Design an enzyme around this catalytic site. Structure first.
Site, short mmCIF file in Angstrom:
data_model
loop_
_atom_site.label_atom_id
_atom_site.label_comp_id
_atom_site.label_asym_id
_atom_site.label_seq_id
_atom_site.Cartn_x
_atom_site.Cartn_y
_atom_site.Cartn_z
N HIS B 41 0.80 -1.21 0.00
CA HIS B 41 0.00 0.00 0.00
C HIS B 41 0.86 1.29 0.00
O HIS B 41 0.29 2.37 -0.17
CB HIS B 41 -1.08 0.00 1.09
CG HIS B 41 -0.59 0.27 2.47
ND1 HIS B 41 -0.82 -0.63 3.50
CD2 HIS B 41 -0.03 1.38 2.98
CE1 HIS B 41 -0.34 -0.06 4.59
NE2 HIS B 41 0.14 1.16 4.33
N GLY B 143 2.43 6.45 9.51
CA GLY B 143 3.86 6.38 9.24
C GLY B 143 4.49 5.12 9.82
O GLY B 143 5.63 4.79 9.46
N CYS B 145 3.50 1.99 9.33
CA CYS B 145 3.40 0.82 8.46
C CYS B 145 4.75 0.35 7.99
O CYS B 145 5.66 1.16 7.80
CB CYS B 145 2.44 1.06 7.30
SG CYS B 145 0.73 1.29 7.81
C1 LIG Z 1 0.24 2.62 8.78
C2 LIG Z 1 0.59 3.68 7.75
O1 LIG Z 1 1.71 4.17 7.70
N1 LIG Z 1 -0.40 4.08 6.92
C3 LIG Z 1 -0.14 5.03 5.83
C4 LIG Z 1 -1.02 6.27 5.98
C5 LIG Z 1 -2.50 5.86 6.01
C6 LIG Z 1 -3.39 7.06 6.17
O2 LIG Z 1 -3.09 8.00 6.89
N2 LIG Z 1 -4.54 6.99 5.46
C7 LIG Z 1 -5.59 7.93 5.45
C8 LIG Z 1 -5.43 9.22 4.95
C9 LIG Z 1 -6.53 10.04 4.80
C10 LIG Z 1 -7.77 9.53 5.19
O3 LIG Z 1 -8.83 10.34 4.95
C11 LIG Z 1 -10.13 9.89 5.31
N3 LIG Z 1 -7.96 8.32 5.71
C12 LIG Z 1 -6.87 7.55 5.83
C13 LIG Z 1 -2.74 4.84 7.13
C14 LIG Z 1 -1.80 3.64 6.97
#
Ligand SMILES: *CC(=O)N1CCC(C(=O)Nc2ccc(OC)nc2)CC1
Ligand SMILES: *CC(=O)N1CCC(C(=O)Nc2ccc(OC)nc2)CC1
Lengths: 304, 304
Positions: B41, B143, B145
């Protein structure tokens, strides 16, 4: 989200652990620059520990009697001295893995990570707090002496504890890296009873703020209190008195959650008086006090 | 003595953490040999996560789009491939700090340490368990992940988890290092509810043995039970069924303490039916299930 009892990454400290042997006693040492720090009781036999005269015992020791081994390679000892309850063994080689470091003496309520070691080898890392009675509740078996406690600020390791002993009650006592014991404890196998292990109030409040930030909000009530009223309850429950300095320290958590510190105190007051009623907060059935306000901010913000 | 929730020393894993950036997404990667492993992802925008077609999104990516940084130095990406839910980025340099390692897929109830990281930098280490519903209760902010879970056997690191997501309930889901999720979870921002988070019975029994070894004995009763009788109670309390394999695994703890496994089951049965009555076991007001029988033996013996 989620909130865990988290230790600092231990790598920087693993690179400093060595084995120190004097006669038949083997414990751990901390190698920083060209000095190895270890508990002075490495010179004692099990008999000597009953009433040791460290200056006299040290007279019978020479540099070649201190065996220092880093990994599977021997370090050459070119000097030795006693500073309070620690021995400083000067070696001919600077530890190539010495991180940026400081020696700090922490106050009760402050948390730190411990890298438990045996034979100079790391076995595990866990987080604990200097209790208000100057003991720590660690996990230390025979051979763990010389294991250290520390905090890390980006790339600088602040060493705050070195393990020396287990009291007859199963709690632990040790020194700062200058060899001064925390509390009234002595490196002698004698009757040493700890005082009241009170709860670190400011840490409990910080942890209640962490709970709100992470979604556990059932304990929030419609009440407020004053510092004096709260402290009357804190005294009754063997909680440390809350000061204006503690309220100031909790300011950023109060700001982030919009919950005034005295309102959180009133929630804590109700938890003390009514109990948890079979409920949990951040997966705990008791009020956690081994997270400082700094730890809550650090974990809730992701400081590396 | 003393018993703590202990994590493995994290040094060997710290030496493998790198930052992976694809477009505007930055997460962590694991650098072993000349391959960097990270959640697939990393190629998604926040919008893409709603319904990603990973094969299609990957077509628009070339080696130069994956920015890999180890410390403050850039690694050259010479290949990329998708294996299940992880990307494998082949780099031109073998990680000089690669420890001896294995990729293992753990079973529910098994514990491991997590080195929480942000921007390829370690922030903390904590111990957790693969829950029976295949979630973990971690501490992961945005961040984090690509942060990994592992166990260490002397000098070999067995990587078992890579963090991918937080469910809407605040619990965590991730994959093994082959990219296969634990449980039924998918790397998509969609309705994914976890099943029943039952208690890991064999771990609770191991922890009760640890309590006896460390002096907390108030809960020991004059009763015994059978596996079938105990399991009727375990079902009622959402505890996992206890099998003869679990009893066999607890054999060395039973031998050390002289307390038959079924007698300990009867003590646990009374704790479930009567509660703790305001008492604690190893500083906990609830029955701890994130210590395996192997962890109890390891901590109670001092394995390095
Ligand atoms: C675990 C990790 O590092 N991730 C990457 C970023 C992601 C995130 O922030 N997603 C996100 C952004 C914006 C919105 O808007 C609704 N929802 C989720 C999570 C996982
Ligand atoms: C913490 C540590 O490494 N220590 C060194 C060993 C020491 C010990 O085992 N002392 C001991 C031996 C024999 C007896 O007999 C009664 N009592 C204590 C503990 C500290």
């Amino acid at each position: 989200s989620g909130f865990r009892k988290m230790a600092f990454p231990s790598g920087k400290v693993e690179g400093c652990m060595v084995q120190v042997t004097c006669g038949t006693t083997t414990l751990n040492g901390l190698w920083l620059d060209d000095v190895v720090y270890c508990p002075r009781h490495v010179i004692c036999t099990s008999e000597d520990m009953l009433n040791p005269n460290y200056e006299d015992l040290l007279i019978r020791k020479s540099n070649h009697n201190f065996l220092v081994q880093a990994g599977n390679v021997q370090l050459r000892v070119i000097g030795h001295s006693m500073q309070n309850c620690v021995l400083k063994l000067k070696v001919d080689t600077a530890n190539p893995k010495t991180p940026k470091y400081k020696f700090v003496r922490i106050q009760p309520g402050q948390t730190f990570s411990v890298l438990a070691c045996y034979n100079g080898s790391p076995s595990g890392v866990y987080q604990c707090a200097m209790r208000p009675n100057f003991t720590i509740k660690g996990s230390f078996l025979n051979g763990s002496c010389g294991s250290v406690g520390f905090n890390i600020d980006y790339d600088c390791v602040s060493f705050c504890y070195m393990h020396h002993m287990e009291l007859p009650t199963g709690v632990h006592a040790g020194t700062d890296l200058e060899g001064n014991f925390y509390g009234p404890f002595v490196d002698r196998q004698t009757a040493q009873a700890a005082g009241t292990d009170t709860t670190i109030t400011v840490n409990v409040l910080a942890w209640l703020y962490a709970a709100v930030i992470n979604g556990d909000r059932w304990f929030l009530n419609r009440f407020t209190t004053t510092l004096n009223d709260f402290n009357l309850v804190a005294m009754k429950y063997n909680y440390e008195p809350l000061t204006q300095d503690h309220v100031d320290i909790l300011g950023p958590l109060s700001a982030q959650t919009g919950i005034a510190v005295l309102d959180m105190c009133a929630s804590l007051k109700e938890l003390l008086q009514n109990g948890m009623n079979g409920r949990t907060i951040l997966g705990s059935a008791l009020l956690e006090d081994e997270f400082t306000p700094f730890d809550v901010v650090r974990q809730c913000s992701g400081v590396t």
